Amino acid sequence: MTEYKLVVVGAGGVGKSALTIQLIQNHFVDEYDPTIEDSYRKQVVIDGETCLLDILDTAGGEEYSAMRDQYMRTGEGFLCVFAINNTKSFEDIHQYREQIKRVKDSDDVPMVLVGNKCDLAARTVESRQAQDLARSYGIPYIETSAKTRQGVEDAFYTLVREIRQH
Ligand SMILES: Nc1nc2c(ncn2[C@@H]2O[C@H](COP(=O)(O)OP(=O)(O)NP(=O)(O)O)[C@@H](O)[C@H]2O)c(=O)[nH]1
Ligand SMILES: [Ca+2]
Ligand SMILES: [Ca+2]
Ligand SMILES: [Mg+2]
């Protein structure tokens, strides 16, 4: 069956792990344990196709950049995650995108921009601001909450649908 190798990137604390765990394991991780490099695999049906998702959950932050380079190399699509209550995380996105382009040696990599923590009310990144960034990259913008599950399947499945257009 078809395998989709997805990679989740973005600043520390934005919810990469919580998103992945919610998708794969159907619960919300409330605590914060920084990630080094974790993988999850699960068989799912997406648009009638039985397939295997292989999801790489990466370490966030400029300090782990070198480590990510090699682990990121076989990624077929990337979720670029910021949190809607963390302006710096949004400002950091372009650096993650640039890393992706470096590791894939391509300007045309399947990606989705994800604004996570949309259950929180202390919003400092407005939807339109993120829409505009995504538009510049030619990719979708989707908001998610790993806490409530809002948008979580949509984000990951949309990434699969972007891979399929490549
Ligand atoms: N309210 C709310 N909290 C969230 C959401 N997603 C993650 N969090 C919280 O934010 C914290 C960090 O989440 P985590 O997934 O560990 O972040 P990360 O991006 O994997 N960090 P790292 O790069 O260090 O591994 C946790 O306390 C988690 O519960 C969300 O959608 N809503
Ligand atoms: Ca929990
Ligand atoms: Ca390279
Ligand atoms: Mg993590």
Ligand SMILES: [Mg+2]
């Ligand atoms: Mg503002």
Ligand SMILES: [Mg+2]
């Ligand atoms: Mg398209």
